[PDB]
Amino acid sequence: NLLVTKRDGSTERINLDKIHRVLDWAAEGLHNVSISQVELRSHIQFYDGIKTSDIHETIIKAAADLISRDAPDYQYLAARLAIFHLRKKAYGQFEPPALYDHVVKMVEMGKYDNHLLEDYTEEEFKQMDTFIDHDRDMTFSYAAVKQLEGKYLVQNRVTGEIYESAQFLYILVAACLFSNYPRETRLQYVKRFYDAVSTFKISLPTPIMSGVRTPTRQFSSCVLIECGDSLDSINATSSAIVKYVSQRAGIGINAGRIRALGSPIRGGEAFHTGCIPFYKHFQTAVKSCSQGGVRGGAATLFYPMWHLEVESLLVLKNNRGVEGNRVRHMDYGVQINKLMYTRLLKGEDITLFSPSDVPGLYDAFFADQEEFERLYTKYEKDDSIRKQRVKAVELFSLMMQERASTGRIYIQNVDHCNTHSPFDPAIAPVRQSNLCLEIALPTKPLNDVNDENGEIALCTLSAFNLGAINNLDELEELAILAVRALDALLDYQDYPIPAAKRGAMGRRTLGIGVINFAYYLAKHGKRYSDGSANNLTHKTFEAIQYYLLKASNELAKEQGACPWFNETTYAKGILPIDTYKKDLDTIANEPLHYDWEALRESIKTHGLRNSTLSALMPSETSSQISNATNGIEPPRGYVSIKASKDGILRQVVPDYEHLHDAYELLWEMPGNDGYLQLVGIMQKFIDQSISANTNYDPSRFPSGKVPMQQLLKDLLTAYKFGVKTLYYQNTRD
Amino acid sequence: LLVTKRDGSTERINLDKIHRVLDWAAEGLHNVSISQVELRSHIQFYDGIKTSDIHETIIKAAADLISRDAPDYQYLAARLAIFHLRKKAYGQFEPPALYDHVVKMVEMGKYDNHLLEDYTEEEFKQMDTFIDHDRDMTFSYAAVKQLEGKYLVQNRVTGEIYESAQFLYILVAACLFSNYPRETRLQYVKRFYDAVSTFKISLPTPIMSGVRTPTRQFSSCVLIECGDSLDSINATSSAIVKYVSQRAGIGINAGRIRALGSPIRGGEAFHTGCIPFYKHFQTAVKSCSQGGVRGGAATLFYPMWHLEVESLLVLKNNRGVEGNRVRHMDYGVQINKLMYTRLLKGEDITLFSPSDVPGLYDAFFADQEEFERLYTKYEKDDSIRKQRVKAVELFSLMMQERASTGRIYIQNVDHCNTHSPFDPAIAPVRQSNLCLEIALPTKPLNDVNDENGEIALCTLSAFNLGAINNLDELEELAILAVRALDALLDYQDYPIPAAKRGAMGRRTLGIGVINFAYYLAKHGKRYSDGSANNLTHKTFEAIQYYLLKASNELAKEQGACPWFNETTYAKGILPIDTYKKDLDTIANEPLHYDWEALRESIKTHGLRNSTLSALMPSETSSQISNATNGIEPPRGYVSIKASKDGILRQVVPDYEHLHDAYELLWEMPGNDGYLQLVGIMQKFIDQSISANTNYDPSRFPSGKVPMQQLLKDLLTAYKFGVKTLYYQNTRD
Ligand SMILES: Nc1ncnc2c1ncn2[C@@H]1O[C@H](COP(=O)(O)OP(=O)(O)OP(=O)(O)O)[C@@H](O)[C@H]1O
Ligand SMILES: Nc1ncnc2c1ncn2[C@@H]1O[C@H](COP(=O)(O)OP(=O)(O)OP(=O)(O)O)[C@@H](O)[C@H]1O
Ligand SMILES: Nc1ncnc2c1ncn2[C@@H]1O[C@H](COP(=O)(O)OP(=O)(O)OP(=O)(O)O)[C@@H](O)[C@H]1O
Ligand SMILES: Nc1ncnc2c1ncn2[C@@H]1O[C@H](COP(=O)(O)OP(=O)(O)OP(=O)(O)O)[C@@H](O)[C@H]1O
Ligand SMILES: Nc1ncnc2c1ncn2[C@@H]1O[C@H](COP(=O)(O)OP(=O)(O)OP(=O)(O)O)[C@@H](O)[C@H]1O
Ligand SMILES: Nc1ncnc2c1ncn2[C@@H]1O[C@H](COP(=O)(O)OP(=O)(O)OP(=O)(O)O)[C@@H](O)[C@H]1O
Ligand SMILES: [Mg+2]
Ligand SMILES: [Mg+2]
Ligand SMILES: [Mg+2]
Ligand SMILES: [Mg+2]
């Protein structure tokens, strides 16, 4: 007897059968889901005159609430109901319009870029429409759909109106990235790429998902800036930061060159007032376009362990101290090499220098370990040179102490970053990383914001979904698609700063990683902690790097190698399999399955389109679209619960039904050794670095406190197996 | 029984030797006891004591005896300290020949070689004859300590003193007039040397310490206007960093930056607020500083009607969190007639983001009539984003924060442009400097090296009103001061193109006064009862007239400044035409000089400098002349300041004869008398004045200064045309 209100404002007798019919549609093919249960929970919330839209939101939430381990398929029931609603919001009906008509409408509204209509004829759009399978919208999980609705689908940010659906996003991202291709291969490339992303084999970054097809050209999310030891450079660095955080890019700042407090300037006309005031200026630059502090501008700043002010720098994040000696809203990366670790093991001292007082020492720190030790010991014995001694154990302990309590004091092993690298350290050394410590690229300081002699490193990201591929040879096709799409994006996107354009156009660096690694391991019955996954990992990441290189090599044949290819180790016939940390042989015996020697000569002859290709990023948001486990990290639980604006979102690990015992949750792990070994094995093939976490449960330790001995042990274990960087330290509460 | 000589030789102590030294210093002094000093000194002697330490002992002994009862101890101590400095620098009392000194110092790298290129040995012999080294005996003890500490060329490592005061004076003169033709050069050098060495002209610290050395960093006063864009905010930030690294004070105009929530590029993004950008300017200002003692200093300016004004006014108080506080800068609130009108009428003030109100920001400075038109237009427009606040509440909040911190300043922007040397339509004054006496045109930069931007600089100096016998001496002194500072403009370096443009275009100078309190007591006048109004009028007419006359004659000789056409002076307008008419009610002193003759001469030949006068605080330079600080009344007859070398006492000039004539700061009833005097000054002053307000809570019931009184004085200042309000001093 109740009445419902239709969208037009008409009223109708309540019809539970209509709701039932919709529930039947979403429930198709699903198991262990109850339509009546959803009906039971939903109906009780109905009142006379309720909006049909509110009815729809009710049944979405009801199904979403029922997502559990016992009935994981509710994640698809809820998702599909939400898809049904999104269709209605965008098209006024379930079935999407013809592609060309949609594009024309959206260009007219100013939501799509007009160049789509310039680069493709109406007939070509008709063809592309035949590629699309809108039913692939029914394969998203509920968390995926919410991220779509929230971050990716083109919408009105004011009114909230949704203007598109997922497959239109996918097909037009494909269409844009391959628009400049010849007609002989263009639409063939579009279809193949569309299939790859819409069936979740290739995962794309947020700025691409939300931007590519729209009038924007801001797609850079990853920026690396090196600051020189001068006022002009500090200003330039600050300016560069401001422009890029205004475009929401994450920043990696190298400030290790800045001379220490008290150092003479121009021979003594003035004296340096310390690094920290300049660090503060970088922080306000990073936070310049942020309101409040929840998820604003983000940066990681890098400095060497032997820096004269290092004891002051290590404590910049802890909640104690006064405002004057604290710079809390950035993260930090301490740069370490073999000599530092040597002093630690020997229980000797570490000498601290200002880089301005030790000629050639800073450069050698990154490019030449033999020369560094020569210079370091030479300067250690010189009394004319300003210095300070600290016990290596005390210094390392202080560092790890702050890493533990804040979780955001990172490590960069700079020797590993240059002895095992795609770059010639004598010409293009790697002297820093990025915000999340997976990017490792060459940089050059600016003397002006528009200095054409400076080099700001950028990197375009993506990931392979290890859970969606049937066999490792599928990566051949996928690498071709990924590399070619990202490489085209380099020419597509805009560059607000000349030094950044130089790096991107000069080196054409890419960073392609993985997601669903944990699921991948459980699938094959392997685990993180017992070394059972070592050989599989070796096999898996050999395939990844080989096919990436093969794709970039063939891209180089077709369109030419990157302008600065000559500065790479690849150009000199060197491959990652030549320069890896030899200790890896003791923990993995999987043989090489691909013809690297044929590749070596093919790279020698034709070069690479891209200087780097692989990097393992955290990828927390993009993973949710594929319902994948996050990057290479193990899941914290079988079902994750996250509070949000639209309520509580539950997400189940892939194939929990059959793999619950096969999974190894994070806190089920004995320690960090097994994981660190896997990371080391990955790093054997990875061009750049890996966002590696360390994890600790205080409950597993006496007195409920993690001892320093263990922290130092794990640090050294990572270094032993060639791990380049260390990201988060997670401590279970 | 034995003393250790400088060579390390030893001889028997001879108290008669010390007695002889004390007699030299005591010559001409009254109420000083040599024996008193001897008694205090002798007790500290031990076997093998250094003669150097003996000298330091008798200096401190004499310094300790400085009092109201015996002020002349300030000269006894000083002369003893001078004696010591002579020995430290020359190995003997009498200085070497000037040329020999210069040659030695150039070789050591302490003096600039261009002195030897621009002057012949024979010319140095001539300059040496100008010098009277006995003028070193005319310093007070505080003056000598500032010399030793800040001015004399010395080794910063070892502490070695390399020169004496008269060499500083003669070589500052020689450098500033080095480019003059030989027909008149040494004549200018001698006249200028006499002026500074007899304390008639006071020079800024960066000039006193720098001019003769290899440096060219002499700018201490910088005004930068920030545009509403990322490029400009970056440019401004870079410029700030560069200038604070040269220890310049900064005035930042950030009022153009749009408010939090404003759309960007039509809604592609939304503004995240002014405050994060203010924080970025602060870290730029403090970028070359360690600790919070002194270091980088800046004042930031914004209009009262800015949409975020309520958030901006409280950026300094000690409460609140780090997120809504930017505490290490000072702020200047910009106000005009309409705001005050709304206050009096008890009406509302509407708050706008300058990005939402076309032409409103420009009119705020240049056109009050047009401002009122646009303001009321936008107030009635409902499509335009806005906020209403009670005028009483807004003014009270401002004054509340001004009182508790003392560092929230006021700029009356209409007074700064209706009574100004600049055409507001072409070159408006939209900000001030760190200490709020400077009022010059600016133009925002789109890059640190933007050659189209304009950063305002100003070169400072002051007349010592206590050292002049009559106001006609200012003719000579103005000629010397104006020519010296104008020469410095071509002498100094410019780290930023935009700064050079302003300096070369307008050649703006800021010359003020010191010893004003002493000057009033000398003439038997006081601050608070209006008895000094006409004297003040007479005095500052002479200052401005002779400054203009000097600059006008320099224009005949060397040409008017390139951008002279942007001045009101170019259109035949004088300060006496545009002053706040209310001044007629509090001063009836007639004009004593031929302003109409000057008017026609300025129309014909122009001015070398767009501005000439500005009244700065002048706390350090005042001590050299033993002058009272600027226009401010002294807080006591004897100031006590603790330092590394002990407690330094300084007596007001001629306390002996004028103790009853002085009017100390807290002997004052209120602010009315002083604000009237500042207003009368402002009639003739080109730029502005660092006017302080003072309050003694003891003089008020409940021990609290009421808001009605704060507003009362605020409106009193506005009534008499006062352009800016600097510090509020609240007695402890
Ligand atoms: N008369 C009704 N009684 C109960 N539920 C209804 C009724 N009409 C629609 N619904 C339900 O409301 C939800 C939203 O439906 P829908 O978006 O189609 O709105 P609508 O009011 O039917 O407008 P339209 O005319 O555009 O179809 C669906 O779950 C649908 O089954
Ligand atoms: N064939 C279909 N398969 C899946 N979802 C569909 C289909 N047809 C419609 N939907 C979705 O189901 C919801 C309701 O659609 P529809 O308007 O046809 O039914 P109804 O509202 O219950 O009845 P009616 O509007 O005709 O009174 C909408 O969200 C729509 O997008
Ligand atoms: N006045 C200053 N106060 C504090 N730090 C300063 C100052 N000037 C420069 N610095 C810092 O000291 C270093 C000097 O570098 P800079 O290039 O700007 O000066 P320079 O004239 O080239 O002298 P140098 O020969 O010492 O490099 C930089 O780290 C800069 O940040
Ligand atoms: N024998 C002495 N007994 C007491 N005081 C002395 C004696 N000799 C010097 N003095 C005092 O020591 C102070 C410093 O004198 P001065 O600089 O001349 O040192 P000095 O040892 O005499 O060196 P020089 O040989 O260069 O003259 C003066 O006040 C001087 O009167
Ligand atoms: N004629 C003078 N007038 C003023 N001060 C003088 C004079 N001659 C020297 N002085 C200063 O007085 C102090 C003492 O001078 P001086 O060295 O001649 O005497 P002394 O040290 O007491 O005796 P001695 O010849 O044994 O060194 C020094 O600081 C010196 O610069
Ligand atoms: N991404 C951003 N986040 C926050 N504030 C920003 C951002 N971009 C610019 N701003 C601020 O917005 C204002 C305008 O920026 P700017 O002039 O540089 O950009 P624009 O492209 O010219 O846009 P507009 O046409 O709105 O001026 C300035 O105050 C600037 O600081
Ligand atoms: Mg319907
Ligand atoms: Mg330098
Ligand atoms: Mg002697
Ligand atoms: Mg703009």
Residue numbers in the entry:
A (entry chain A): 4 to 736
B (entry chain B): 5 to 736
How did the manuscript describe this experimental structure?
Class Ia ribonucleotide reductases (RNRs) are allosterically regulated by ATP and dATP to maintain the appropriate deoxyribonucleotide levels inside the cell for DNA biosynthesis and repair. The α2 subunit houses the active site and the allosteric sites, and the β2 subunit houses the di-iron-tyrosyl radical cofactor.3−6 On every round of turnover, these subunits come together to form an active α2β2 complex, which allows for the transfer of the radical species from β to α, affording ribonucleoside diphosphate reduction. Excess dATP inhibits RNR through the creation of an α–β interface that restricts the ability of β2 to obtain a position that is capable of radical transfer. ATP breaks the α–β interface, freeing β2 and restoring enzyme activity.
The first binding site for ATP is the same activity site to which dATP binds (site 1). The second site (site 2) is generated through a series of conformational changes afforded by the binding of the first ATP molecule. This subtle shift of the ribose results in the loss of a hydrogen bond between the ribose 3′-hydroxyl group and H59, whose side chain flips 90° and now hydrogen bonds to a water molecule. The second nucleotide-binding site (site 2) is directly adjacent to site 1 within the cone domain, sandwiched between helices 1 and 4. The phosphate groups of the two ATP molecules create an octahedral coordination environment around a central Mg2+ ion. The site 2 ATP ribose makes hydrogen-bonding interactions with the backbone carbonyl of F87 through O2′ and O3′, suggesting specificity at this site for ribonucleotides. Our α2-ATP structure shows three ATP molecules per α in total: one ATP in the specificity site and two ATP molecules in the activity site. Consequently, helix 2 has an extra turn in the α2-(ATP)2 structure than it does in the dATP-inactivated α4β4 structure.
